Amino acid sequence: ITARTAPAGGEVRHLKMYAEKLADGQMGYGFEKGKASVPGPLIEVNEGDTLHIEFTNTMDVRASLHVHGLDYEISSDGTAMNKSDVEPGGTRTYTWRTHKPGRRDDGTWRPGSAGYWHYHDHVVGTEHGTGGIRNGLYGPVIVRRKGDVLPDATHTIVFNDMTINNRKPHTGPDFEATVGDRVEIVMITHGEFYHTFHMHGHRWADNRTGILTGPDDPSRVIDNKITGPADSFGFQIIAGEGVGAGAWMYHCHVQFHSDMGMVGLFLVKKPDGTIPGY
Amino acid sequence: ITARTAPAGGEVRHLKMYAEKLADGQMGYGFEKGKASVPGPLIEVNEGDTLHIEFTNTMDVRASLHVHGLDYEISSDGTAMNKSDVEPGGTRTYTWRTHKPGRRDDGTWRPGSAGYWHYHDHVVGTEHGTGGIRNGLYGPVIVRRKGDVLPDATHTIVFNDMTINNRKPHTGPDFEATVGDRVEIVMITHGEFYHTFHMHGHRWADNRTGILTGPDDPSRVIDNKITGPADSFGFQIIAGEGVGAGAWMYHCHVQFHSDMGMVGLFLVKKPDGTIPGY
Amino acid sequence: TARTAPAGGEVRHLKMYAEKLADGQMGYGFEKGKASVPGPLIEVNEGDTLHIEFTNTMDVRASLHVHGLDYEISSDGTAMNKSDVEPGGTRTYTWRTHKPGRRDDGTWRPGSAGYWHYHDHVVGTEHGTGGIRNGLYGPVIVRRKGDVLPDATHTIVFNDMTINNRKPHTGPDFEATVGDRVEIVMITHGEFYHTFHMHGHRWADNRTGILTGPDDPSRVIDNKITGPADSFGFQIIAGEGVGAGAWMYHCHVQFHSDMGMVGLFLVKKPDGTIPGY
Ligand SMILES: [Cu+2]
Ligand SMILES: [Cu+2]
Ligand SMILES: [Cu+2]
Ligand SMILES: [Cu+2]
Ligand SMILES: [Cu+2]
Ligand SMILES: [Cu+2]
Ligand SMILES: [Cu+2]
Ligand SMILES: [Cu+2]
Ligand SMILES: [Cu+2]
Ligand SMILES: [Cu+2]
Ligand SMILES: [Cu+2]
Ligand SMILES: [Cu+2]
Ligand SMILES: [O-]
Ligand SMILES: [O-]
Ligand SMILES: [O-]
């Protein structure tokens, strides 16, 4: 493999995050005050890293930070129950850890932390974050295994109830690549509804990475995946591979949902920047 | 293996398809005028084949042909957006390609096209084919990999909203086999609802082919599979294997749906044609 | 050096009953007056045969239908096939299981092993809608030779808007000690899709919930979408890499967790304490 690959992890990383009310009523996380986003910033680490997040709640309501998949002690689970959320104006330091796979003492195999995960609030609106999640307090987390192929770019598509990334119906988001780019998608679902994520012209493996290790990988190859609240998966595709440049739709394939606006464009451009038929 | 297996592909195939309005209000694809069906005809090809489909819309409304999984250029995605649908009475030649898996230049592994896929309209009723799909404009596509086991017969079961293959509730379809037949199922979902596909007395591997390569295949073995709009999977079973002849129900396991008629019979006969207790 | 399942092949016998419960529910049991919701766990090894002398103590027809395992049409528990059981009746269902192996044609036959379940098929409707709603469901585990055996198994069933037919916001809760090998059988029933989530723990989305080793492509997850009659299972090391604590599990459909589909996986330190509880 002469594509770029993830290094062995084991760093201790530090990071500041904030939760802000947005002018429009939404709420979002951010690495800097005044720079919050929905989805929140992507956090990306290598198996074995430790991540210390100094999180500061700048809102008038209790808020928290709960993560999927990664190792964390009960003091960092972000629930009111475990006294793990954050009062208005407060600051708390969450710790997320990750480990590599390996043999246990009993001889069994411990799974690694690697995968496409996500983080979200657990105390805004209800003790389960129904309010925070609806408002935009969610973001992606990627834990890489040594040797994983690194992409050219990562995009995050969150089906949040009847919206993509809390956007107005029929307003995307759209993404751009050039034929040949290694594009990574992180795909998260939140809220009340099941969906099916479909991409025109591209396909991926329904496994941890979206990629087949080689000819022995029995994983199904798909272009349509059902998902429900808090499901997270990801994959890599070579933009336009075997199909060429184009305005390639992605969307929920629940007919009413796509009719109502859960559609976006994967805009794959020729080297001259053009998109056939757009 | 002394079962029949798929050959290496790489032929250029040519096909004529039509969309027709049916007397009863439904819409269907067909290989000949007046011989349309719901589901539409099964297209089956080998990885590496190219398929040129001269498609003619015999209806009074615009209609199109959109396919999952297979390779196609933006001019064949069958969307209005890309000027890819077909005006009433028009004729257009869609091209679908397929490829085998293999090493890329960067050392990574390109997935092959092989799988259980499907095609459907994209412009009847809405820019997403909600009307076409609901009227019956969907059909199965099978792309086989060199060495895949070939079945004795293939049946197609489509959960379209509250119906199987657009049939009236409680009217099947029923299928028939003789104990020992290698029966292939293509299972496709369409519309607004999630379902769970269950088959009594039989089970399959939840992977690309429904079959375990051998003792190292970690794939879950199941008899119940959740599916959402535009999901497609398939599998093979040995009719009556380890269970004998019988009228074996298949159905959606969502209690209300099976109660409302999403039920059918896998009628597995003894060599004398009889079904115990039917 | 963990305990592993033996090769199967025993012929097992078992009595089961269906009872109406005082509160209106219905449940299976191995003994009259000892029925549960979920019903008792049945566990066997690939190759075992299981003869269940089922007696219906209810005033309505009831039956016993199982997923995954081998059974003849006479044991499929449907009214259609004349294999349900009249009130007060007794019928002997036979479930069989086989190991994997090469067929005559050279193909590979899948084994019966997995996380399965049984439920009624004739109470309320010809599909058990009433039986299932009332509590007539339980788990079945078929083990493959060599499978890791757990310290304890718990069964979590998402039945419509309930866990194990319990009032919203009443668990069930489960207890382990940091380090225990805890097995979960997770079954869904009724009308709704759910997503099962556990705080602080994860598993492999394959047959066993465990990775055989480095070459297992299976996704590791902590959220699984699930629909009526879906069954999966897994083992976790309680508190592994996360420590003791009151770890929530719940449906992650926001409204469902708000409405009460929540429970606690109470992982204790060796002194019995739970930080923050
Ligand atoms: Cu939670
Ligand atoms: Cu949707
Ligand atoms: Cu498509
Ligand atoms: Cu969550
Ligand atoms: Cu589309
Ligand atoms: Cu259904
Ligand atoms: Cu069944
Ligand atoms: Cu489609
Ligand atoms: Cu059934
Ligand atoms: Cu739920
Ligand atoms: Cu969580
Ligand atoms: Cu069932
Ligand atoms: O589509
Ligand atoms: O069933
Ligand atoms: O959560």
SS (H, E, C) chain A: CCCCECCCCCCEEEEEEEEEECCCCCEEEECCCCCCECCCCCEEEECCCEEEEEEEECCCCCECCEECCCECCHHHCCCCCCCCCECCCCEEEEEEECCCCEECCCCCEECCCCEEEEEECCCCCCCCCHHHHHHCCEEEEEEECCCCECCCEEEEEEEECCEECCCCCCCCCCEEEECCCEEEEEEEEECCCCEEEEECCCCEECCCCCCCCCCCCCCCEECEEEECCCCEEEEEEECCCCCCCEEEEEEECCHHHHHCCCEEEEEEECCCCCCCCC
* Å between A119 CA and nearest CA of chain B: 25
> What's the Cα-to-Cα distance from B120 to each of A60, B33, B129, rounded to whole Å?
50, 18, 8
C145 touches chain B (CB under 8 A): no
Can C11-143 and C152-268 be said to share one CATH topology? yes
Q: Which helix (H) or strand (E) is C257 found in, with range?
A: helix C254-259
On the question of a cis peptide bond just before residue C139, with omega within 30 degrees of 0, the verdict is: no
Candidates C148, C197, C199, partner chain A, best to mutate (most A CBs within 10 A): C199
Question: Which residues make Cβ contacts (< 8 Å) with residue C135, sequence separation at least 6?
Answer: C21, C25, C26, C27, C37, C38, C39, C159, C165
Please give the distance, rounded to the nearest whole angstrom, from the Cα atom of residue A170 to the centre of ligand 6.
Answer: 29
Question: Quick one: which of B73, B77, B59 has its CA closest to B124?
Answer: B59
Q: Which of A73, A113, A207 sits opposite C217 (nearest CB)?
A: A207
Residues, CB within 5 angstroms of ligand 8 (ion): B 230
Residue with tokens 């808020």: A63
In eight-state DSSP terms, residue B258 is H
The 3-state DSSP composition of chain B as helix, strand, coil percent (nearest 5) reads 5, 40, 55
CB contact under 8 A, B109 and A2: no
> Chains contacting A with at least 3 CB pairs below 8 Å?
B, C
User: Which residues of chain A are within 8 Å of residue C1 when distances are taken between CB atoms?
Assistant: 105-107
Question: In terms of DSSP H, where are the helices of chain B?
Answer: 130-135, 255-259
Specify whether the CB–CB gap between C154 and C182 falls below 8 A: yes
Ligand nearest to the CA of residue C229, numbered in listed order = 12
User: Which residues of chain A are within 8 Å of residue B71 when distances are taken between CB atoms?
Assistant: 242-243
The type of residue at A31 is F
**Rounded to a whole number, what is the distance in angstroms from the first to the last CA of chain B?**
35
Q: Using what technique was this structure determined?
A: X-ray
CB contact under 8 A, C127 and B259: yes
d(CA B14, CA B94): 10
**Rounded to a whole number, what is the distance in angstroms from the first to the last CA of chain A?**
35
> What's the Cα-to-Cα distance from A210 to each of B45, B172, B195, B268, C15, rounded to whole Å?
24, 37, 24, 38, 47
Question: Quick one: which of A278, A277, A198 has its CA closest to B120?
Answer: A198
Q: Which of C81, C125, C218 sits opposite B246 (nearest CB)?
A: C81
In 10 A of CB B102, how many CB atoms?
Answer: 11
Residue with tokens 């002394």: B2
d(CA C130, CA A93): 50
On the question of a cis peptide bond just before residue C168, with omega within 30 degrees of 0, the verdict is: no
Our answer on whether the CB atom of A120 is closer than 6 Å to any ligand 15 atom is no
Specify whether the CB–CB gap between C41 and C51 falls below 8 A: no
Tokens of B147: 């060495």
Question: Quick one: which of A38, A57, A63, A174 has its CA closest to A118?
Answer: A38
Our answer on whether the CB atom of A66 is closer than 6 Å to any ligand 15 atom is yes
d(CA B130, CA B121): 8
Question: Quick one: which of A192, A191, A185, A43 has its CA closest to A118?
Answer: A43
Pairing of strands B91-97, B50-57: antiparallel
Tokens of C35: 């029925």
Question: Quick one: which of C186, C182, C142 has its CA closest to C164?
Answer: C186
d(CA A220, CA B114): 9
Q: Does domain A12-144 have CATH number 2.60.40.420?
A: yes
Candidates C147, C252, C261, partner chain A, best to mutate (most A CBs within 10 A): C252
Tokens of A220: 């199904």
Question: Which residues make Cβ contacts (< 8 Å) with residue C45, sequence separation at least 6?
Answer: C5, C6, C7, C8, C9, C10, C97, C142, C143, C144, C145
The type of residue at B104 is R
Residues 24-63 of A with CB under 8 A from B: none
Q: How far does CA A267 lie from the centroid of its chain?
A: 20
C224-250 burial: b if 16+ Cβ within 10 Å, else e = bbbbbbbbbbbbbbbbbbbbbbbbbbb
Please give the distance, rounded to the nearest whole angstrom, from the Cα atom of residue C252 to the centre of ligand 4.
Answer: 7
Our answer on whether the CB atom of B120 is closer than 6 Å to any ligand 13 atom is no
CB contact under 8 A, B255 and C228: yes
On the question of a cis peptide bond just before residue B173, with omega within 30 degrees of 0, the verdict is: yes
Asked whether residue B257 is marked as a ligand-binding residue, the answer is yes
User: Which residues of chain A are within 8 Å of residue C217 when distances are taken between CB atoms?
Assistant: 205, 207-208, 212-213, 217-219
Tokens of A148: 């994983």
Burial class (CB in 10 A: 0-12, 13-18, 19+), B44: middle
CB contact under 8 A, C221 and A72: no
In 10 A of CB A102, how many CB atoms?
Answer: 11
Question: Quick one: which of B180, B185, B205, B203 has its CA closest to B269?
Answer: B180
Tokens of B209: 């082919």
> Chains contacting C with at least 3 CB pairs below 8 Å?
A, B
d(CA C26, CA C159): 14
On the question of a cis peptide bond just before residue A39, with omega within 30 degrees of 0, the verdict is: yes
Backbone dihedral angles phi then psi of residue C150, each to the nearest 5 degrees: -90, 175
Question: Quick one: which of B41, B191, B234, B254 has its CA closest to C188?
Answer: B254
Specify whether the CB–CB gap between B249 and B218 falls below 8 A: no
d(CA B210, CA B208): 6
Name residue B128's beta-bridge partners: none
d(CA A35, CA C96): 61
Specify whether the CB–CB gap between B139 and B39 falls below 8 A: yes
d(CA A1, CA B108): 6
Backbone dihedral angles phi then psi of residue A94, each to the nearest 5 degrees: -80, 145
Tokens of B176: 């028939």
d(CA B228, CA A193): 12
CB contact under 8 A, B255 and C127: yes
Question: Quick one: which of B187, B224, B220 has its CA closest to B206?
Answer: B220
d(CA A28, CA A31): 10
* Å between B209 CA and nearest CA of chain A: 8
d(CA A167, CA A20): 18
Our answer on whether the CB atom of A196 is closer than 6 Å to any ligand 13 atom is no
d(CA C164, CA C187): 10
* Å between C46 CA and nearest CA of chain B: 13
Pairing of strands C223-226, C194-198: antiparallel
State the number of CA atoms in the 13 A half-sphere of A171 facing the CB: 7
d(CA C235, CA B210): 25
Q: How far does CA C64 lie from the centroid of its chain?
A: 15
Widest distance between CA atoms in chain C = 60
Edge-to-edge strand list for the sheet holding B43-46: B43-46, B138-144, B115-120, B66-67
In eight-state DSSP terms, residue B211 is S
Tokens of C52: 């269940």
Specify whether the CB–CB gap between A91 and A55 falls below 8 A: yes
Our answer on whether the CB atom of A190 is closer than 6 Å to any ligand 15 atom is no
Please give the distance, rounded to the nearest whole angstrom, from the Cα atom of residue C199 to the centre of ligand 1.
Answer: 6
In 10 A of CB A273, how many CB atoms?
Answer: 9
Please give the distance, rounded to the nearest whole angstrom, from the Cα atom of residue B66 to the centre of ligand 8.
Answer: 7
Class of C11-143 in CATH: mainly beta
B255 touches chain C (CB under 8 A): yes
Mapping DSSP to helix (H, G, I), strand (E, B) and coil, where does residue B187 land?
strand
d(CA C241, CA C244): 10
Please give the distance, rounded to the nearest whole angstrom, from the Cα atom of residue A257 to the centre of ligand 2.
Answer: 5
- Say how many CB pairs under 8 Å bridge A and B: 136
Asked whether residue C194 is marked as a ligand-binding residue, the answer is yes
d(CA A172, CA B138): 27
Specify whether the CB–CB gap between C95 and C112 falls below 8 A: no
Find the length of chain C. Answer: 277
**Rounded to a whole number, what is the distance in angstroms from the first to the last CA of chain C?**
34
Tokens of C71: 């059974």
User: Which residues of chain A are within 8 Å of residue B222 when distances are taken between CB atoms?
Assistant: none
d(CA A156, CA A209): 15
Residue with tokens 């409304």: B61
The type of residue at B32 is E
Q: How is chain B split into domains, by residue range? A: 12-144, 153-269
The type of residue at B162 is M
The type of residue at B203 is R
Asked whether residue C252 is marked as a ligand-binding residue, the answer is yes
In eight-state DSSP terms, residue C164 is T
Name residue C246's beta-bridge partners: C266
CATH of domain A153-269: 2.60.40.420
CB contact under 8 A, A77 and C197: no
d(CA C181, CA C203): 12
Which residue in chain C is spatially nearest to B207 when comparing CA positions?
C206
CB contact under 8 A, B224 and C230: yes
Specify whether the CB–CB gap between C122 and C63 falls below 8 A: yes
In eight-state DSSP terms, residue B76 is G
Find the length of chain B. Answer: 278
> What's the Cα-to-Cα distance from B76 to each of A244, A277, B73, B85, B139, rounded to whole Å?
11, 12, 6, 8, 17
**C152-268 has which fold?**
Immunoglobulin-like (2.60.40)
Mapping DSSP to helix (H, G, I), strand (E, B) and coil, where does residue B37 land?
strand
d(CA A54, CA B64): 53
Backbone dihedral angles phi then psi of residue B180, each to the nearest 5 degrees: 100, -15
Tokens of C204: 């492999």
Question: In terms of DSSP H, where are the helices of B1-105?
Answer: none
Residues 76-95 of A with CB under 8 A from C: 77, 79, 81-84
In 10 A of CB B89, how many CB atoms?
Answer: 10
Residues, CB within 5 angstroms of ligand 12 (ion): C 229
A11 touches chain C (CB under 8 A): no
d(CA B69, CA B161): 22
- 3-state secondary structure string across C105-140: CCCEECCCCEEEEEECCCCCCCCCHHHHHHCCEEEE
d(CA C243, CA C86): 51
Question: Quick one: which of C204, A243, C225, C15 has its CA closest to B110?
Answer: A243
The type of residue at A138 is Y
Please give the distance, rounded to the nearest whole angstrom, from the Cα atom of residue C59 to the centre of ligand 8.
Answer: 49
